[PDB]
Amino acid sequence: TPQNITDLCAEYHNTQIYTLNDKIFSYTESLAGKREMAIITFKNGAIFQVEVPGSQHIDSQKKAIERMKDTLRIAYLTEAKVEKLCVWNNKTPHAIAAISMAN
Amino acid sequence: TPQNITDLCAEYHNTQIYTLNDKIFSYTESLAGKREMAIITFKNGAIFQVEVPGSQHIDSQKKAIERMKDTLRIAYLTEAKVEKLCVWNNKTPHAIAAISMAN
Amino acid sequence: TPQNITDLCAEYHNTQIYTLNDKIFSYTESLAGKREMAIITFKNGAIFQVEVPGSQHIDSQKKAIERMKDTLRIAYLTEAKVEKLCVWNNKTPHAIAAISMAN
Amino acid sequence: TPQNITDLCAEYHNTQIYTLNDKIFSYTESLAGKREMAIITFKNGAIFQVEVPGSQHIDSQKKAIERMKDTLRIAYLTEAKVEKLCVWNNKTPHAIAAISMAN
Amino acid sequence: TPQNITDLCAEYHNTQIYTLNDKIFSYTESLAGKREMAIITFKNGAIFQVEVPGSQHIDSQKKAIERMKDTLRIAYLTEAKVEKLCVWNNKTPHAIAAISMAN
C-alpha cells in the first residue's frame, strides 16, 4: 500500500501529479444525463474533471467517485489549499484520481 | 467531454445559460408527495427548480439530482457566489441542469 | 409546478403556512423504535415535527424526509433564518411539508 | 406523537433523561468489527454510546442510528450545546435514544 | 461494551493506540481502482490509512469505513484536535480502527 499521493499515482500508467498549492478557483457540477460530473479549475488555468461513472470504472470506485465530488465541493467552499492532484492525462479535461490537502 | 458549464450546456437541446454572479437569495425545499423538490431564487427575481425525479431522468441522474440539492443548500448557507446556471427553459420554473460557482 | 412555498402548500389538503422569520430555537431527534423523527421549536412557542416515515408516505418521499431532517439540523447549527413553513395541520405537532429560508 | 424529548423518552421502558446543558467534551468512533459504534463524553464525566446496530433494533432504526452518529459528530465539531439526552439505562455505557440541542 | 477508545483497542489483536493530541497535518483521498482509500499524516511524521475495503472487513464494517473517511475529512477541514487513534500495526501505513477527538 502506498503512503503518499505521489507513490500512489506512480502505480498507474497515464497519471501525473500536478502540484497546485492553491485553493480551487471554481467548482462546476452537472446532473444532465450522461454528464453527471464535476469540473474544477485553478487560477493558473488548470482544469480537471471527476469523470462520469462508466465502464472504465470498477464497482469499488463508484462510492469513491461520489466521495471525491463531495470533497471537492467542501474544499471549494472552505477555500482549502489543494497540495497535489493525481490525474489521468489520457482524458480531456484531465481526470482526478487522487487529491492531497495540507495547510 | 466539455471543459466548462457553457460548453456542457450546449450539448443539450432546450437548455440555456443564465449568468447570475450572485449569492442565492432564498432556498426552499419540499418533502410533500409528488413535490419532492427544491426551489432557489435570486435578488434579480430569477427562480429555478431542481425537478421532482421522474421519467425524464435516467438512473444515473438520480444521485446527481440529490447531490444538486445538497450543493444548493450549502451554497445558500455559505453565501457562495453562483456564476452560471445551465437550465432547461421548457419547465416553469426553469430546471437546473448544472451550476458553476466562482468569484 | 409551483414557484414558491405558499403555492406548493396550497396544492395539498390540511396544510397551512407559518411565517417565522426566525432561527430555529431547538432541534431534537430520536432513533427510538417507532419514533424515528425530528422535532423543532421556535422562540415564539411553535413546535413542529418531521414525521416518522410511514404508510402515509409514498416511496418518493422517503429520501425527502431524510433530507428535510438534514436541512433542519444544519439550519439550526448555522442559525439560519426560517422564512416560512408549510405544515400539515391534521397532525400533532404540526408536521413539516416544506420550508423556506431567506436572509 | 410526543412534542418534546422528555415526553418521547417517557414512552419507553429503561430510559431516563440526562440534562447536560453543555457541549460534547470528546467524540470517539470505531470501524472495528462488532464495535462499529460511537462514544461521547461530557466534561462532568458522563459517557454515552450510540449502539452497534443489532437485532435489538428494527429496520426503521437503522437509518436513524446512522443519522445520530452524524448529528453527534457535527455537534462536537461546532461545539453545540446539548440540552438533554434520552438514554437506555440497561446498557453500559448508557445508550442514546434521542438528543435535544438548544442555546 | 467498552467506554473509551483505549479499552476498545485492547479488544483486538495487532492493535495499538497512538496518542497524537494534534490536528491532521494532511489529508489524501483516492478513487483509483484498487486504491479507494484515505491517508492522513501528522506533523510528527505519523502516516495512517483507512484501508481499501476487502475480505478482512465484515459487512457491518462497510458503512463505518465510509463514515471514518467522512470524519477524517471534516476533522481535517475544522483543524480538530485528534486525541488518539487505535490502529492495526500489521499494515503499512498503520490502518485506522478508531479515532477519538477532544480539545
Ligand SMILES: CC(=O)N[C@H]1[C@@H](O[C@H]2[C@@H](O)[C@@H](CO)O[C@@H](O[C@H]3[C@H](O[C@@H]4O[C@@H](C)[C@@H](O)[C@@H](O)[C@@H]4O)[C@@H](O)[C@@H](O)O[C@@H]3CO)[C@@H]2O[C@@H]2O[C@@H](C)[C@@H](O)[C@@H](O)[C@@H]2O)O[C@H](CO)[C@H](O)[C@@H]1O
Ligand atoms: C504540470 C505537469 O505536471 N505536467 C505537464 C503537462 O501539463 C499540461 C497538459 O495537462 C495539457 C494537456 O492539454 O494541458 C495543460 O494545461 C492547459 C490547460 O488545460 C486544462 O488543464 C489541464 C491540467 C488538463 O486538464 C487539460 O485537459 C485542460 O484542458 C488550459 O485550461 C489552459 O490553462 O492552458 C494550459 C496550458 O497552458 C497543462 O499545462 C500545465 O498546467 C497549466 C495549467 C499551466 O500551469 C502550464 O504551465 C502547465 O505546463 O503537459 C505540459 C505540456 O506542455 C507540460 O509538459 C507540463 O509539465
Ligand SMILES: CC(=O)N[C@H]1[C@@H](O[C@H]2[C@@H](O)[C@@H](CO)O[C@@H](O[C@H]3[C@H](O[C@@H]4O[C@@H](C)[C@@H](O)[C@@H](O)[C@@H]4O)[C@@H](O)[C@@H](O)O[C@@H]3CO)[C@@H]2O[C@@H]2O[C@@H](C)[C@@H](O)[C@@H](O)[C@@H]2O)O[C@H](CO)[C@H](O)[C@@H]1O
Ligand atoms: C507504542 C507507539 O505508539 N509507537 C511505537 C512504534 O511506532 C513506530 C512504528 O509504528 C513504525 C512503523 O512500524 O513507524 C514509526 O513511524 C515512522 C513513520 O511511519 C509511518 O507512521 C507510523 C505510525 C506507521 O503507520 C508507519 O506504517 C508509517 O510509515 C514514518 O512516516 C516516518 O515519519 O518515520 C517514523 C519513525 O520511524 C513509529 O514511530 C513512532 O511514531 C513516529 C511518528 C515518531 O513519533 C517516532 O519517534 C515514534 O517512535 O515503534 C517505535 C519503535 O519502532 C516505538 O516503539 C514507538 O513507541
Ligand SMILES: CC(=O)N[C@H]1[C@@H](O[C@H]2[C@@H](O)[C@@H](CO)O[C@@H](O[C@H]3[C@H](O[C@@H]4O[C@@H](C)[C@@H](O)[C@@H](O)[C@@H]4O)[C@@H](O)[C@H](O)O[C@@H]3CO)[C@@H]2O[C@@H]2O[C@@H](C)[C@@H](O)[C@@H](O)[C@@H]2O)O[C@H](CO)[C@H](O)[C@@H]1O
Ligand atoms: C438567459 C436568457 O435567455 N434570458 C432571456 C429570458 O429570460 C426570461 C425568461 O427566462 C422568462 C421565461 O419565463 O422568465 C423571466 O424571468 C421572470 C421571473 O421568472 C422566473 O425566473 C426565470 C429565470 C425562469 O426560471 C422562470 O420560469 C421563473 O418563473 C419571474 O419570477 C420574475 O418575477 O419576473 C422575471 C421577469 O422580470 C426571464 O427574465 C430574465 O431573467 C430575469 C431573472 C431578469 O434578469 C430579466 O431581466 C431577464 O429578461 O427571456 C427574456 C425575455 O424578455 C430575455 O430574452 C432574456 O434574454
Ligand SMILES: C[C@@H]1O[C@@H](O)[C@@H](O)[C@H](O)[C@@H]1O
Ligand atoms: C451516565 C453514565 O455515564 C457513565 O458513568 C457510564 O459508565 C454509565 O454507564 C452511564 O452511561
Ligand SMILES: [Ca+2]
Ligand atoms: Ca477568501
Ligand SMILES: [Ca+2]
Ligand atoms: Ca470566498
Ligand SMILES: [Ca+2]
Ligand atoms: Ca488551515
Ligand SMILES: [Ca+2]
Ligand atoms: Ca451576509
Ligand SMILES: [Ca+2]
Ligand atoms: Ca447566535
Ligand SMILES: [Ca+2]
Ligand atoms: Ca446570512
Ligand SMILES: [Ca+2]
Ligand atoms: Ca471553543
Ligand SMILES: [Ca+2]
Ligand atoms: Ca448559537
Ligand SMILES: [Ca+2]
Ligand atoms: Ca489554523
Ligand SMILES: [Ca+2]
Ligand atoms: Ca474547539
